[PDB]
Amino acid sequence: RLYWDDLKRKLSEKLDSTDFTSTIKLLNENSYVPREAGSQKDENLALYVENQFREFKLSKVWRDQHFVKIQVKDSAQNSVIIVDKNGRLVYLVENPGGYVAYSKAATVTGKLVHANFGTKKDFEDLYTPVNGSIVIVRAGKITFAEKVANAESLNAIGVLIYMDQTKFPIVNAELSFFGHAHLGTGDPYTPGFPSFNHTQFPPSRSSGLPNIPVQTISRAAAEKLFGNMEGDCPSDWKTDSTCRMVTSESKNVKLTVSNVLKEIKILNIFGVIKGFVEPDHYVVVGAQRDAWGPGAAKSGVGTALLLKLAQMFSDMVLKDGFQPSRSIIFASWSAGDFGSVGATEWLEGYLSSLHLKAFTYINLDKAVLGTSNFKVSASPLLYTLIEKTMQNVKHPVTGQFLYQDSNWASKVEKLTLDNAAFPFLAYSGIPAVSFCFCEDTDYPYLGTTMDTYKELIERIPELNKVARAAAEVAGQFVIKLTHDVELNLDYERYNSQLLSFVRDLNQYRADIKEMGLSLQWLYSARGDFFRATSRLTTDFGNAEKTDRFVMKKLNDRVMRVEYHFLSPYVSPKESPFRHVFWGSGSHTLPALLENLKLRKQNNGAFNETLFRNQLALATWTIQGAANALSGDVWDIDN
Amino acid sequence: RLYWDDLKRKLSEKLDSTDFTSTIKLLNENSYVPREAGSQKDENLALYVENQFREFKLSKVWRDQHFVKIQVKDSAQNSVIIVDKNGRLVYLVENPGGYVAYSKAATVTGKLVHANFGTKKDFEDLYTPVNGSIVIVRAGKITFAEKVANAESLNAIGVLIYMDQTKFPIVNAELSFFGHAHLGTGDPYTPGFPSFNHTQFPPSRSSGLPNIPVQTISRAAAEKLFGNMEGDCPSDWKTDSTCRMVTSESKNVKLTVSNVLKEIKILNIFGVIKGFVEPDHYVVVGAQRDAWGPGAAKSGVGTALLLKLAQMFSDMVLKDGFQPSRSIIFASWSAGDFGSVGATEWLEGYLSSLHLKAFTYINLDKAVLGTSNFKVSASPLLYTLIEKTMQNVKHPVTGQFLYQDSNWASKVEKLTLDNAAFPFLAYSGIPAVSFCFCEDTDYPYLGTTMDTYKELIERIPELNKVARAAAEVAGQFVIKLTHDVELNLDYERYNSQLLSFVRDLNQYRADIKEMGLSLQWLYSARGDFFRATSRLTTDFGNAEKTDRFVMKKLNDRVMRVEYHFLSPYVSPKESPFRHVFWGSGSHTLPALLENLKLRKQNNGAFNETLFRNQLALATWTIQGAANALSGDVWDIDN
Amino acid sequence: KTVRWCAVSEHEATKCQSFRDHMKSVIPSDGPSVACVKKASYLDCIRAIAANEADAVTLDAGLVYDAYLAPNNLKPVVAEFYGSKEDPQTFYYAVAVVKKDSGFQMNQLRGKKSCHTGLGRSAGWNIPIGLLYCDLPEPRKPLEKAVANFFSGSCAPCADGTDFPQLCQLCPGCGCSTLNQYFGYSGAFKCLKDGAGDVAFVKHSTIFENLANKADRDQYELLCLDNTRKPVDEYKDCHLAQVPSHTVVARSMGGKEDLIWELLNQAQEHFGKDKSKEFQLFSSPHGKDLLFKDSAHGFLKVPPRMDAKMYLGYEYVTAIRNLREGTCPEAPTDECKPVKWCALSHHERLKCDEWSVNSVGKIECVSAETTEDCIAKIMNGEADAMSLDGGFVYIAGKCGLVPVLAENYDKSDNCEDTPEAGPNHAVVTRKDKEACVHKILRQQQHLFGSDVTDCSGNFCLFRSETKDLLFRDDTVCLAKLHDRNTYEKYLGEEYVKAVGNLRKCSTSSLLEACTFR
Ligand SMILES: *[C@@H]1O[C@H](CO)[C@@H](O)[C@H](O)[C@H]1NC(C)=O
Ligand SMILES: *[C@@H]1O[C@H](CO)[C@@H](O)[C@H](O)[C@H]1NC(C)=O
Ligand SMILES: [Ca+2]
Ligand SMILES: [Ca+2]
Ligand SMILES: [Fe+3]
């Protein structure tokens, strides 16, 4: 009855009548003015969104409630001071309104060295040893957690995070910001399993957590610190001329953090529209609701786009005549500020129920922050789905199509830990996507008390149009994903990913031959994978599209690809992010190369016994994914 | 066209014309006379079976070849002697023809204490401490590996295994026997992954292996040892009056084992008949081929039943008109003597390809050993399938039906490590079954050089009939499993299993209340599970059996039950046997209770922090299995 | 708006065309209209409503079972009544017709030839086959092959001719089409009168529909359950079993139950019985029993709450499921089928689950949202018992559930021996499970009933976490009712009329459904 083109036009019409700005402003009222996770204002918006889903008259609307542990700054405020070699001396630098969640809260004192961003590369190029001293770094190069993780690796005492003027042109230099240092996602006090009263919350600690104390400080406070430091910072880093390399041997800094934990009641509000052909299969759409500050950009826009997309698809099914093949689930996550907790406790909670039922996740957080360029990071199984949507949706400002860079597939970057889509793709093995109408420089008030609606509407005049353009992109991902029998997942897009891996590894073919090793097996692994998809492609081409039975046996084999790259050799509790390609730790394909890079130098940093196993499991993870993709369990030739 | 009753009668006719005895004898000829794994005689039979499958004209016949490491007794034979307190003294006891694979091969010397069978219960009731001494035990109470594992727990130096006259009425008292001490399955040198040249065989050791040296000795040698020992063995154990409790403080025993490893070429021979409705789903039928000795009972019968069942179903499809709905795979495993290696390397190798495609495994090893009673251990999802087959097949000797014990479901025992079905059910999560026309006392020449065809045909005169009765039972499991649209898996049979668990745990409700714990969550976990199956049952009752689409969405939910009980919290490499109910280690439901039993005594043996997590993950493993079984991801109420 | 209708065969297609043309002469007054879809069988008609091609088609009560099964999902909306318009009947008699002085009796049918209305139909297959399924020689499954061997020659409409040749010995190919000579009530009587079959399983009204002379009807006899024969005119005193009437079915969701009933209530007045001479809804010169059954005398609305499995009833739904699976009930073993308790709230099934475990699996829990919802579950078989108050017992009672235990509150030496009048809370249950409910619950009394205040250490059955979770908290014991008490016998006489009058104004969806048939 209704086709793609009849659906694209029907969506566009709904987008044109939809007022986003009015919605984002209503989410930034006095009653949602304070939005910390688990606060009464957080639950207030939760009830609003829930009641709103029900008002749209969706097929079902439910809620999950978790009791996770977060960290908050108590009556005992933390402080950063400079002290003398014999004892407490000189002067106080700052008291920080903004803290870092998961903080050690242990009073420490030592030399202060500038590690710049805190990148693994940044610590190697430092002429000053960090062994036994406090490091100061600028945020936004690597997730807060990674900054600390990287510092704790070279034995640091503490970590100071500040916002330089170059990367963050903010006027108020006394402004503080928020964030978490937990390397990972979900409640860190219940890793691997959900925070349900059911589990009785047993004593379990996440390996993500870092003993070292972390604190955020304003620009003014770091400037004060540089006054006591010496050594001009390298022009290599685009930074302020205030920047100073190290403290004087006379005076050093003393950080004292005393953050306490707090058990809260987190609420996840859902809603679903059942598909008509295969209701049990669904695509999930989520958006963060809680925010440390006002969060107009951090969650205001997202939750605004979630409510409206839910509305638009509700109106398309009920009134227009839109008949989706697979269900759609709209999710309002909470505790996102602490590491996508709400969403991760959901995944760790019903993992078995969405095993091969959830075939894609679309994230709406931080979709609108700029206006210059369009940015999107996702799983290659969504590349083709994005590329066709890019050359279909027009930029909100310039009348041109979003698809301008032909080789954009190559320019895409991995999903990061702070992103809500990370847990879905790396832990669950559910293709995920996170698009953004980003800017060359990140949003300055992203985690501050200046993330107001006024600030957002001032930096982006045409906020309504960009929000509509945004909602159109996510709206086409769903229409494409649930519309027709064919599933918009391109398994052929992984050939390039593997070719890239093997080629990078081929560069070290001399170190492989030196060891009792041959790389011929990885060649066949990648080769067999290409054959597997090509046979799957021809299988799709040689089948009747209208036959329900033969398309199901092929689409079920397409969905499994995301799952097959999740390593089956690591414990899902200690190393949650199993995905070989986008997860974390040694097993991943990137870790295999990272370990081998140390062999080239002939240093003892290289673990040979480790490499031989990294290679074997990864060689077979790629092969197993290949065999399972084509030829059956007997039609397989090698 | 052809129904169950038309299939049952068509099978029976094929069974009546099939001569088994002639087949088992042809497998016990001079050319297969020696059958150690990886030997030329082993491969000889492999080629025969392969060529035989092809002669049956099956849809496809293939082979997998692994390069696993086993252990063999070299030129340096091991020896057991009694020595003096100052040095080597007295006399030599025996040189053992038969060894224990995976042996430490480290020369040791110490007091010799009788631990009886070697059971965890046996070591607790010993008045003599084992701390720092060699223990001697009688085989057949617990797998060889467990005997050693249990001894290494209470710090033993070595282990001597012998066959007493009471449990093993053998005439030749100088007869030696074979076995492995590896706690686990598959090649121990490639745990978690397959032994394919692909993996490059990296340095990886299985936690199954025990440092302590193990050796088998004949009855005569243990009798000689008892001569030097004192203390009459308790009448509690049905044993010989020769049996002696401990050695004299003057003389102690010295064991010296020097087994070397050997890399071999193992071959798995397969064959498959494709089903007609859903070819991608299959039931697997395997049987061990290799044997340390002649193995007429250990593998002769099995491989004989495998070849014939392959023949009978080949003739039923080709000539009779049998049209199976799902495929059938016949497997001849090798290296079974070393721990179901061949079969485990297959499972660890194509795990992804038989994920939710293999829905049941039927094992043919040691099917015929006695004639008195019928014994079968399996996954409850096969209980109803067995009970209907029991009251359908008639005993070979007495004209009565096999179904005589009504409460036989309760008398069934867990699958053991030495069984080839263990890896399938506990590691893979594939319902498995292992039936036997067993005897009140196990087969005496099971692992000896007296497991000849002559010995077998003498202890069981009517071997042909018992073999046919055997082949009929496994033949009905397949006809039932592939015959019709409904899958013969009874998910309702787990209600009793869970009720049993919760009731046992309810006994300790006083220790649960003493700790900050409530058991109400486990009640609802089991309750929600019952509702889930009951809703699934009614769902089967309220659907058209002839509709392919709605039966597939229900049978796919039935197959998943076996998978859902495999813990998702443990690493599949270190703790392979994940199944909560039939696997190994702490996570399992039995381990939860075993740990709590130590709390009742108020000793420090109880790990409280461990229990709180054993409880939480198991509470949720049962709940997750429940939620995923019914109500969808949104229709779920709690 | 127009409602599409399904037609089977060419003959019913022409009757549909006339149903269209005649209707648009006084239509539309408000909205109603009719359309025609051509299908080969009734199975094609049920599948077409599910794919929105049609909207309604009339089915036999035994064919209603096939319609509500996935993926067809169809619930009866309008049911036709038999007899008169003054005194309507919602159930017709299924009987067995034979020739006079044949010798054959109900028990002696083996070797005999048969004529059936249609595979899966009430009078034709399920009532007649139903009694013979446990007497049939093994194998019992498939059911069709067993009937193909029992009888020598048989004609079963809608039956696979390739798999069961013997089942279409009388009518080759086994047409479900109106066109086949032997199809329907009158079709099996034509298979008998012609001398093809020895017996025909039809409705009591089939003899009048084919033969009008009373002298010609005397040439035929009716079989009785007690292996006797009686006059055809005595259908009430001698018949096989009572079945629910034919009814029109539509989708549960999106089947417009109101747009079809408004059409049918108007099709009966204009072109129904004794109203017009141009078009009749219950008579057609092109064929008999087209669209509707000629024996019908109008239509009646099917309550909203009443679903397919409630329309047919426990007694009949269970007989079809046991007939298709081949399950025959053995003499009661008194083993006691596990009891299925029904919980309402979250707090109820949490105390129930703790009770299920303590009872060693003798009691299990089924959850329902509302109090009326639980009452429905006990009906179809999803639940077995629950505790109810005096008002609800009267509602459940009118459905078919008799109470067996009463909650006493006055403590005495013999609590179970002597029950109290009051009305108190009664534990209603189904007819069959009345025996075990009577025994299993009485075994929990000695195990968790009157106990010392040791509850934290040990489970207590009447103590709740809040207030009245399953049973009332102030209850001492569950009194055994020695007399076979119904809803009327437990509630006295003055209270019975009391709640009847009050339910007159304050009417529920469960009460209008259980008081329908
Ligand atoms: C869950 O546990 C918290 C304490 O962590 C408690 O405050 C709350 O009431 C509990 N809720 C339920 C349903 O058990
Ligand atoms: C596999 O490795 C073994 C040595 O472990 C070697 O003898 C054999 O030739 C190799 N085969 C292949 C195909 O690589
Ligand atoms: Ca968690
Ligand atoms: Ca292995
Ligand atoms: Fe009828």
Report CA A53 to chain centroid distance, whole Å: 26
Which two tokens mark B277?
């409705």
Ligand 4 centroid, distance to B342 Cα (angstroms) = 9
Q: Give residue A266's Cα distance to chain centre.
A: 20
List the beta bridge partners of residue A230. Answer: A246
CA atoms of B286 and B362, how far apart (whole Å)? 7
Question: A528, A515, A505: which is closest to A610 by C-alpha?
Answer: A515
∠ CA A528-A533-A535, rounded to 5°: 90
Three-state DSSP state, B435: strand
- Residue B470, both tokens: 């055997």
**In degrees, to the nearest 5, what angle opens at C-alpha A454 toward C-alphas A449 and A459?**
100
B220 Cβ partners below 8 Å, 6+ apart?
B94, B173, B174
B616: Cα separation from own chain's centroid: 29
Q: Are B237 and B125 in contact (CB under 8 A)?
A: no
Place of tokens 């309702």: B492
> Considering only CB atoms, which chain C residues are within 8 Å of B513?
456
Sign of the dihedral defined by the CA atoms of residues C92, C94, C98, C102, in that order: negative
What three-state secondary structure class fits B333? strand
Strand extents, DSSP E, B123-171: 134-138, 158-162
Q: Say which residue the tokens 């890793």 belong to.
A: A191
Do the strands B92-94 and B79-84 form a parallel or antiparallel pair, or are they unpaired? Answer: antiparallel
In terms of Cβ atoms closer than 10 Å to its own Cβ (0-12, 13-18, 19+), residue B6 is middle
Single out the residue of A111, A99, A77, A90 nearest to residue A253, CA to CA: A111
Give CA–CA dist C157/C146, Å, rounded. Answer: 16
Neighbours of B9 (CB within 10 A): 11
Q: How far is C60 from chain B (nearest CA, A)?
A: 17
- At B84 the three-state DSSP class reads strand
Task: Say whether B527 and C358 touch across the interface (CB within 8 A).
Answer: no
CB atoms within 10 A of CB A175: 19
* Nearby residues of A124 by Cβ (< 8 Å), 6 or more positions away: none
Closest approach atom of ligand 2 to CA B263 = 5
Pairing of strands A134-138, A112-116: parallel
Task: Specify whether the backbone of B218 is left (phi greater than 0), alpha (psi in -120 to 50) or beta.
Answer: beta
Contact between C188 and C202 (Cβ < 8 Å): yes
**SS3 of A342, please?**
helix
- Nearest residue to B511 (alpha-carbon basis) of B447, B587, B597: B597
Closest residue by Cα to residue B66 from B347, B330, B374, B475: B347
Helices assigned H by DSSP within C428-486: 434-448
Nearest by Cα to C289 from C449, C180, C167, C367: C180
Distance CA A462, CA A556 (A): 42
Distance spanning both ends of chain C, measured CA to CA: 30
Cβ count within 10 A of residue A164: 22
CATH hierarchy code of domain C333-517: 3.40.190.10
Q: Classify each residue of A21-51 as buried b or exposed e, where b means 16 or more C-beta atoms within 10 Å of its C-beta.
A: bebbbebbeeebebbbbbeebbbebbebbbe
Q: Taking Cα atoms as reference points, which of C73, C59, C74, C7 lies closest to residue C35? A: C7
User: Is the Cβ atom of A200 under 6 angstroms away from ligand 1?
Assistant: no
What homologous superfamily does CATH list for C1-99+242-332?
A: Periplasmic binding protein-like II (3.40.190.10)
Q: N- to C-terminal Cα distance for chain B?
A: 46
Q: Which residues pair with A214 in a beta bridge?
A: A159
Q: Select the residue from B523, B536, B637 to test the C interface by mutation, using most C Cβ atoms within 10 A.
A: B523
User: Which H helix or E strand runs over A137?
Assistant: strand A134-138
Ligand 1 binding pocket includes A263 (Cβ within 6 Å): yes
Report d(CA A581, CA A590) in Å as an integer: 7
Which pair of structure tokens corresponds to residue C429? 């249950």
Residue C411 CB-density burial (10 A; 0-12 exposed, 13-18 middle, 19+ buried): exposed
Do residues C43 and C176 make contact, with C-beta atoms less than 8 angstroms apart?
Answer: yes
Tokens of A221: 């406070």
The H helix count followed by the E strand count for chain C is 17, 21
Q: Which residues of B27-53 are buried (b: 16+ CB within 10 A; e: fewer)?
A: bbeeebebbbbbeebbbebbebbbebb
Measured CA to CA, the distance from residue A274 to residue A279 in angstroms comes to: 5
Phi, psi of C208 (to 5 degrees): -80, -35
SS3 content of chain B, % helix, strand, coil (to 5): 40, 20, 45
- Cα–Cα distance, B270 to C325 (Å, whole number): 37
3-state secondary structure of A80: strand
* C10 SS3 class: helix
Distance in Å, CA A198 to ligand 1 centroid = 9
Q: Give the CA angle between residues B506, B508, B513 to the nearest 5°.
A: 95
CA distance B241 to A577: 60
Chain C: partners with 3+ C-beta pairs within 8 Å: B
The domain locations on chain C are: 1-99+242-332, 100-241, 333-517
Instruction: For residue C376, give both structure tokens.
Output: 């429905």
Question: What's the token pair of residue B161?
Answer: 């295994």
Q: Is the dihedral of CA C343, C349, C355, C357 positive or negative?
A: positive
Residues ≥6 apart with Cβ < 8 Å to B170? B163, B219, B444, B445, B448, B450
Of A161, A283, A142, A151, residue with least CA distance to A222: A161
Whether a cis peptide bond, with omega within 30° of 0, leads into C139 is yes
**Considering just the CA atoms, what is the radius of gyration of chain A in Å?**
25
The H or E element spanning position C4 is strand C2-8
Cα(C261)–Cα(A635) distance, integer angstroms: 58
In B, which residues are within 8 Å of A576 by CB distance?
Answer: none
The three state secondary structure string of A29-51 is CHHHCCCCCCCHHHHHHHHHHHH
Residue A351, φ and ψ in degrees, nearest 5: -45, -50
Say if CB A382 and CB A433 are below 8 A apart.
yes
Instruction: Please choose, from the candidates C195, C232, C197, the residue with its C-alpha nearest in 3D space to the C-alpha of residue C211.
Output: C232
Environment of ion ligand 3 (residues, CB < 5 A): A 186-187, 190, 348
> Mutate which of B283, B350, B633, B636 to disrupt the A interface (most A C-beta within 10 Å)?
B633
Give the residue among B108, B121, B118 at the shortest CA–CA distance from B145. Answer: B118
Cα separation of A381 and A412, whole Å?
A: 13
Reduced to 3 states (helix: H, G, I; strand: E, B; else coil), residue A208 is coil
Q: Count the helices and strands in chain B (H runs, E runs).
A: 19, 21
CB C302 within 8 A of CB C76: yes
Let me know: does B429 contact B565? Beta carbons within 8 Å: yes
Give residues preceding each break in chain C, C–N over 2.5 A. 422
Task: Provide the token pair at B447.
Answer: 């692992």
Q: Output the CA torsion C163→C168→C171→C176 (10° steps).
A: -60
**How far is CA C258 from each of CA B229, B563, C24, C152, C424, rounded to the nearest angstrom?**
94, 47, 20, 47, 40
Q: Are C198 and C104 in contact (CB under 8 A)?
A: yes
Ligand 1 centroid distance, CA of A201 (Å):
10
Hey, what amino acid is at A366? K
Side chain identity at residue B374, one-letter code:
F
For chain A, how are helix, strand and coil distributed in percent, rounded to 5? 40, 20, 45
Place of tokens 């008579």: C283
Strand B375-378 and strand B432-436: pairing?
A: antiparallel
Q: Look at the alpha carbons of A47, A53, A58, A63 in this order and tell me if their dihedral is positive or negative.
A: negative
Give per-residue burial for A478-492: e unless 16+ CB within 10 Å, then b. bbbbbbbbebbbbbe
> What residues form DSSP beta bridges with A156?
none
- Cα separation, C100 vs A539, whole angstroms: 67
B residues 510-539 lying closer than 8 A (beta carbon) to C? 510, 513, 520, 523-524, 526-527, 530-531, 534, 538-539
C-alpha distance from residue C201 to each of C113, C130, C316 (Å): 11, 12, 18
User: How many Å apart are CA B27 and CA B301, to the nearest integer?
Assistant: 9
DSSP character for B401?
B
- Are B531 and C366 in contact by the 8 Å Cβ rule? The answer is yes
- Strand C385-388 to strand A112-116: parallel, antiparallel, or no bridges (unpaired)? unpaired
Sign of the CA dihedral running C128, C132, C136, C139: positive
One-letter amino acid for residue C487 of the chain: Y
- Structure tokens of C245? 């009437």
Same fold, C1-99+242-332 and C333-517: yes
Query: For chain B, what's the residue count?
Result: 638
Tokens (6 digits) for A90 = 């000189």
- CA-CA distance, B117 to B475, in Å (whole number)? 36
Under 8 Å between Cβ of B620 and A348: no
Ligand nearest to the CA of A340: 3
**Distance between CA atoms of C202 and C205, rounded to whole angstroms?**
8
Domain C100-241 carries which CATH code? Answer: 3.40.190.10
Q: Is B200 in the pocket of ligand 2 (CB under 6 A)?
A: no
All structural domains of chain B: 1-74+260-493 (3.40.630.10), 77-257 (3.50.30.30), 494-635 (1.20.930.40)
CB atoms within 10 A of CB B69: 17
Cα separation, B631 vs B528, in Å, equals: 10
CA distances in angstroms from A17 to A3, A12, A200, B313, C386, listed in the order given: 22, 9, 48, 66, 53
Q: What is the DSSP string of B212-278?
A: S-EEEE-HHHHHHHHHTEEEEPPTTS---SS-EEEE-SSEEEEEE---EEEE--EEEEEEEE--SSE
Bridge partners for C4 per DSSP:
C35
- SS3 (DSSP) at A224: helix
Resolution in A: 3.3
Q: For the residues of C100-160, what is the DSSP string, one character each?
A: TT----SS--TT--EEES-TT-IIIIIHHHHHHTTTSPSP-SSHHHHHHHHSSSEE-SS--
Q: Which residues share a beta bridge with C5?
A: C36, C56
Chains C and B touch (3+ CB pairs under 8 A): yes
In contact, A252 and A82? CB cutoff 8 Å: yes
**Using an 8 Å Cβ cutoff, are A209 and A188 in contact?**
yes
Which residues are registered as beta bridge partners of B185?
none
- Which of B251, B217, B82 has its CA nearest to residue B138? B217
